[PDB]
Amino acid sequence: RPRFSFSIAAREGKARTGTIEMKRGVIRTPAFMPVGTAATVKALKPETVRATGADIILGNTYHLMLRPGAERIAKLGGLHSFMGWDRPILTDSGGYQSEEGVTFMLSPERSIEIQHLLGSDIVMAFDECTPYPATPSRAASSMERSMRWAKRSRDAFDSRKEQAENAALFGIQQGSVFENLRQQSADALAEIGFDGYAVGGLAVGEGQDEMFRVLDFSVPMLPDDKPHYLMGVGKPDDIVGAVERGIDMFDCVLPTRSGRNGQAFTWDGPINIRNARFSEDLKPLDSECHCAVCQKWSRAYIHHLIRAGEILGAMLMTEHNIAFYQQLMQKIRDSISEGRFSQFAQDFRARYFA
Amino acid sequence: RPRFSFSIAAREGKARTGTIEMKRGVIRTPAFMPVGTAATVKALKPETVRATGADIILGNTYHLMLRPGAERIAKLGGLHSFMGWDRPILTDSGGYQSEEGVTFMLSPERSIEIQHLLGSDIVMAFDECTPYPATPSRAASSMERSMRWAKRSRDAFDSRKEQAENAALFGIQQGSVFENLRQQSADALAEIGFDGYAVGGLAVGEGQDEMFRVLDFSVPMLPDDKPHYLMGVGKPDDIVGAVERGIDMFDCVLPTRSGRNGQAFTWDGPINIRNARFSEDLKPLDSECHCAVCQKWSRAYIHHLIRAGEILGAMLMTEHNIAFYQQLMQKIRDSISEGRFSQFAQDFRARYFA
Ligand SMILES: CNc1nc2c(CCNCc3ccccc3)c3nc(N)[nH]c(=O)c3cc2[nH]1
Ligand SMILES: CNc1nc2c(CCNCc3ccccc3)c3nc(N)[nH]c(=O)c3cc2[nH]1
Ligand SMILES: [Zn+2]
Ligand SMILES: [Zn+2]
Secondary structure (H helix, E strand, O other): OEEEEEEEEEEOOOOEEEEEEOOOEEEOOOOOOOOOOOOEEEOOOOOHHOOOOOOOOOEEHHHHOOOOOHHHHHOOOOOHHHHHOOEEEEEEEEOOEEEEEEEEOOOOHHHHHHHHHHHOEEEEEOOOOOOOOOOOOHHHHHHHHHHHHHHHHHHHHHHOHHHHHHOOOEEOOOOOOOHHHHHHHHHHHHHHHHEEEEEEEOOOOOOOOHHHHHHOOOHHOOOOOOEEEEEOOOOOHHHHHHHHHOOOOEEOOHHHHHHHHEEOOOOOOOEEOOOHHHHHOOOOOOOOOOOOHHOOOOOOHHHHHHHHHHHHHHHHHHHHHHHHHHHHHHHHHHHHHHHHHHHHHHHHHHHHOO | EEEEEEEEEEEOOOOOOOEEEEEEEEEEEEEEEEOOOOOOOOOOOHHHHHOOOOOEEEEHHHHHOOOOOOHHHHHHOHHHHHHOOOOOEEOOOOOOOOOOOOOOOEEEHHHHHHHHHOOEEEEEOOOOOOOOOOHHHHHHHHHHHHHHHHHHHHHHOOOHHHHHHHEEEEEEEEOOOOHHHHHHHHHHHHHHHOOEEEEEEOOOOHHHHHHHHHHHHHHHHHHOOEEEOOOOOOOOHHHHHHHHHHOOOEEEEEHHHHOOOOOOOOOOEEEOOOOOOOOOOOOOOOOOOHHHHHHOHHHHHHHHHHHHHHHHHHHHOOOOOHHHHHHHHHHHHHHHOOOOOHHHHHHHHHOOOO
């Protein structure tokens, strides 16, 4: 496989489906990346993560640098070997205070170095993620700093031959909710040049309507021929709408975290499995889901497990929710390839919100 | 398969190896039964429990009657269906205050009824487990009460046709550390008649030397042609010594509980994986273990997981420890069948305690 190749196989409106080829494997897009902050996707073995359909997972510069340490993981053979995942890993840069970086120490150069030490396949530029709400002045200052940091990221990555030759580098667009700042950011990133482009600074309290409004003008500012990654998104309906606006990649803690908290995603909407109405419900979590959890266990059992604080409850809820997300992405991919994504999006929503 | 058949295939001293045939499957003896108190063997899917080699698991009258409720589990199709384990289940009776029973309500009749509602394959008589130390008078009174309760258990089980026809009933010997009381108890149980006989009231603070001393005279008091179950035992070396004294069945929370606490069993002795000496140790938990955990993950990773409080840490430690216990039982079975168990016991100990 090449270091990096993104091919678009089909389109419908702003929506795209295709593949990212990398040395450690192929990524089908639109893609959902399970999050694994402490070098584990919580409560799941990697084979289970893979079984659910994930092609790529997300790791974190900030958390791993603190524990167990980036140098330590490199000494032990890198993150892939350490946690037992041999497919691509994307690492966030720790961006989610001086011009040099952030002490708490992280700078563009150290960030890129840590991602190298971890052996990340898709490296994110080190940014400043702009709080919401932000005045235009502050959003501008922060965006500008990020673009400077973007160039610094690019140069550090490029200066490390093994990294430049085997991994990919994504730039992150900032600018808050302001169209002109988003455009300046996109321009700057495109001029520097990256393997893919993320939309940063969303999903930070602005709400779906505003998020979608910003996506409406921001995603077409990015190079069309490269992947578009929406960081930190999101709920199933967020994902569908974002794909309708041209997003190809997603990460989110929702399926894992809310799973351990009793929230199960279904095609009929989320449910909270701890509610007493499930205590004698022999149906599986979701009626159509193909995952092994729904093949074998009842709502009633899982209700009991979660109420009892049992680890198997977290395990089963998490496997189910990640499988659910992967099935969602598969149905998205399939409908775009068949040119019926807009109808799928409508059908999904009618039933999810019924 | 029959309701119950115990066949002894080989012997060495007091040690025996054979099989218990029951409707839901065959149990190889000497057997280790993983404990699953809240209708789950903590942090493991049943398929994983089975993969490690378990033939039978243990469930609990006391815990399940409280949550989620025995009637409720029966309504949902029984414990096997509920938790997804289709092989034999042994249930303890809640014995671990008046002549009628125990309010907190449990009596022999209710206990046997709850085990029926759960659909247990091996039902334990409802006993009074005698605290240690006990004076002879108190041990006698408690033992006598248990024998009365033993008869009551037998009659309740026998009065329930479906139970009597498809499950088995084990009696529990009491008597503390006193030979004459143990003998009276054994006699009483044999006169009533059971499918198997447990040695109760040990492993309750007396220490290995005393436990083994009591086993020395107590196990030969039990019918030779029926299984001998030591309740609540134990550490790997406890198990070996108890088999040398004629025990065929064991249950214990140690492998699961101490696994979540960072304790890993190895042929070189237990280790505490959280100790800093493992933080960069790329060897698997145990050098010879065949389990999937040791096939794939390092001490270093698991050290990190447990230190970080990650659920995967509990999962991997628990799978390993239960596999370890099953491997122990397999080596015990094999060496007895080959007439080299005494040599195995010596070799085991030399290395485990080196
Ligand atoms: C939930 N909304 C949200 N997430 C955002 C992230 C983090 C992406 N998720 C990875 C992660 C997982 C756990 C802990 C920390 C990070 C961002 N990362 C960066 N670098 N820059 C952003 O603008 C930015 C914006 C975000 N909004
Ligand atoms: C650890 N030492 C010990 N365990 C003993 C048990 C319980 C066996 N293990 C099942 C279980 C697991 C978790 C919670 C409760 C029970 C006994 N059970 C009964 N019925 N009678 C005993 O004499 C008796 C003596 C014991 N000693
Ligand atoms: Zn499912
Ligand atoms: Zn192992």
